[PDB]
Ligand code: HEM
Ligand code: HEM
Ligand SMILES: Cc1ccnc(CCc2cccc([C@@H](N)Cc3cc(C)cc(N)n3)c2)c1
Ligand SMILES: Cc1ccnc(CCc2cccc([C@@H](N)Cc3cc(C)cc(N)n3)c2)c1
Ligand SMILES: C[C@H](O)[C@H](O)[C@H]1CNc2nc(N)[nH]c(=O)c2N1
Ligand SMILES: C[C@H](O)[C@H](O)[C@H]1CNc2nc(N)[nH]c(=O)c2N1
């Protein structure tokens with residue numbers, strides 16, 4: 100049947116008909132809803148062939164040349180290549196279309212209003228970890244752009260049956276080290292403890308600060324990873340200050356400008372690209388609320404609350420809430436002052452509402468994961484909290500893959 | 505591992521498996537193709553008897569007499585009764601057990617650490633609207649208990665073939681009028697425009713303020729609903745003031761102490777109690793964030809922000825967030841001053857985490873609706889944000905039912 104989708108603030112109804120074009124299973128079945136799960140529950144030629152055709156059809160429809168002779172000849176080439184070789188290759192303009200669609204289709208992304216504006220770097224001619232580094236360095240320079248951040252993706256060579264994958268070991272191109280103490284505690288980012296240790300063990304000389312940038316561990320097929328230190332001028336960073344609380348700068352806090360995810364797999368027409376790092380710009384609550392305030396990250400709420408002189412002995416003073424708001428305010432202010440692109444969670448969710456409306460007219464629906472779209476502070480103050488959403492998997496798609504160690 | 509849903513906590517790293525979802529004998533809204541967990545509305549003798557047997561088996565396990573001779577005799581008495589009459593009647597202790605189990609089972613309730621402490625008033629002897637009113641007045645006096653609130657449910661007679669239902673038309677026992685204005689705005693609570701107008705059609709003389717307490721519209725089998733005014737000394741209210749912002753008291757805001765939901769159906773062993781009003785106490789975010797700041801409710805955020813002198817022309821000031829926090833704090837402060845029971849969203853969520861642990865040991869799971877359990881401000885600052893949840897329908901249950909008009 101066809102899901103009814105209601106906005107509770109406005110009373111308006113739509114029906115998602117694009118859901119029918121989904122060829123997958125999500126985590127849920129008749130007897131129990133598993134939507135809150137962060138991981139879905141299980142991480143031949145016919146198969147590949149139908150996924151290939153479907154993707155070729157999406158491409159030629161996108162340029163309004165469906166049924167053309169180009170369309171039919173491309174179907175024939177893909178067929179002939181799969182029948183002899185068990186695999187095929189995309190043309191560059193197909194890869195570009197496919198990367199944009201993968202982003203468009205990502206149900207957890209609030210930034211999708213930007214989906215048509217994505218710079219795609221073809222790095223499928225890469226043959227060594229050394230060459231991976233030069234492409235990664237050029238992507239960072241392009242995407243950073245002295246703070247006028249531009250969305251980008253760099254695509255390395257596809258998985259092939261005979262062989263190991265191209266992989267970037269790091270989860271993002273820029274991450275801070277986390278150093279485990281003999282006494283349990285961590286200095287830096289507890290999220291990166293394991294990658295930190297891998298880096299030491301492949302020969303990195305560690306620092307001892309709270310904000311030490313990690314090197315990259317880059318792996319070409321069936322070779323041990325190699326270590327590459329990013330040149331410090333490539334990594335733009337922003338020191339955090341508050342616009343009225345003078346002591347805030349004293350905390351010595353800072354964050355990197357460029358959020359660039361490097362561990363997800365890109366699937367397009369049945370082909371899998373195991374290294375395809377992509378970047379955009381931050382929404383302030385990622386840094387302000389999750390990276391700095393989560394109890395298992397930098398966990399700085401109590402410090403800020405004491406500096407603000409609040410009553411910490413009791414939850415009903417709403418000390419955590421007042422502190423979180425000021426930290427988010429510091430991130431926005433600080434990024435604005437440094438002229439580095441950032442979006443607050445109100446403007447981001449307003450732009451996502453407009454995206455749902457464009458997609459309803461364009462495609463008859465939009466996949467969206469409510470738990471990840473609604474921000475982690477001030478949920479019900481944003482329009483997306485009051486919006487029902489339907490989550491489903493379309494292809495092309497970004498997916499999780501196993502850590503390569 | 506096991507064949508049951510894996511449930512992870514991402515803050516602590518801990519994992520459980522829910523085995524309770526096995527006893528869901530009834531499907532939710534989701535299928536393998538699509539997740540519908542943010543949808544708010546979820547659309548025979550042998551049929552009753554399987555539900556009744558199921559519920560009697562639950563009762564007898566709960567008192568540890570399963571397989572007993574008393575258990576077998578009750579099962580037979582229930583079949584005998586259904587057999588001759590089409591229906592059956594619950595013993596007093598079975599109704600008590602059933603009503604607690606329905607609370608315990610409710611996936612959207614964050615207050616369930618309290619489930620075992622529910623005073624059940626048995627009003628199955630009621631024969632008129634006048635008498636429903638007396639029983640509701642007694643329920644309000646008992647639960648309110650001058651500010652020291654006590655959880656309670658009153659159970660009116662069950663649905664019965666042919667004969668009309670008992671129904672309270674109001675959605676809660678205490679509610680504020682909403683009066684549609686000529687220009688098209690609403691004075692009072694816009695949630696309550698329909699019930700307000702029905703009260704007017706049925707002979708109530710309406711006030712014209714922002715916090716006018718509504719009369720109850722109470723319906724006995726096969727009769728026009730009758731109108732009853734609550735004596736105002738029964739309805740405890742709390743005027744709002746802020747602990748440091750002296751002007752906040754001047755806004756003349758207030759809320760009622762008792763949250764008492766009156767339009768849900770209580771289903772136990774296939775029997776349906778169409779009127780069974782229940783009450784607890786407030787979590788502060790319900791008043792402070794949803795009822796006072798939702799755009800479609802009292803919508804007071806801009807007026808507070810203007811009094812705090814905030815920059816309301818730009819989203820990146822975080823003016824919404826800072827005003828919402830102060831409104832929440834005024835709520836907590838004011839309830840505390842007045843000695844009326846209230847819980848903040850940090851205490852509430854921490855207690856719900858404890859409930860989840862208790863239920864893991866008692867029953868091997870707990871059904872929970874993540875989007876409703878995570879509070880509407882400060883989400884990721886509560887431990888429930890980081891906890892995966894499995895949603896499913898167990899019975900006894902509270903269910904929605906269509907409006908009686
Ligand atoms: C341009 C600015 C962008 C913004 C502000 C943005 C915002 C976000 C946010 C806030 C999340 C939530 C992730 C988290 O909480 O961990 C996210 C998830 C995601 N975004 Fe974006 N996004 C942007 C660009 C991109 C780009 C360029 C791509 C790919 C081309 C992308 C693909 C995704 C994907 C795949 C996820 C899902 C991760 C998961 O499933 O775990 N987004 N986005
Ligand atoms: C003791 C204090 C209580 C607290 C703090 C509390 C808290 C809450 C809250 C915040 C919600 C979400 C409400 C909303 O967003 O509209 C809720 C839902 C609910 N609670 Fe409670 N609760 C309490 C007692 C009760 C009692 C006594 C019952 C029944 C005996 C009950 C049954 C429910 C049900 C059935 C729902 C779900 C409503 C739905 O599906 O729309 N709770 N609870
Ligand atoms: C559980 C798990 C396993 C594997 N990977 C992940 C997260 C992958 C991820 C993808 C997109 C964005 C983010 C965000 N955390 C980082 C980010 C990236 C971009 C491009 C923009 C932006 N504003 N923020 C993270 C989680
Ligand atoms: C769509 C629809 C149709 C019919 N009813 C509903 C909601 C019914 C409801 C149930 C429980 C709690 C609340 C809450 N809104 C009110 C409440 C009640 C209690 C007992 C405690 C507390 N802290 N807060 C509302 C929705
Ligand atoms: C259990 C829950 O699904 C998990 O904590 C999710 C909740 N929502 C999220 N939303 C975003 N954007 N990012 C996250 O990491 C999470 N974590
Ligand atoms: C669309 C979405 O399901 C809806 O707005 C929900 C979200 N979570 C909520 N959670 C609570 N506790 N109460 C609500 O009214 C809602 N509204």
Ligand SMILES: [Zn+2]
Pocket residue numbers: 127131132133134534538539540541
């Ligand atoms: Zn689901």
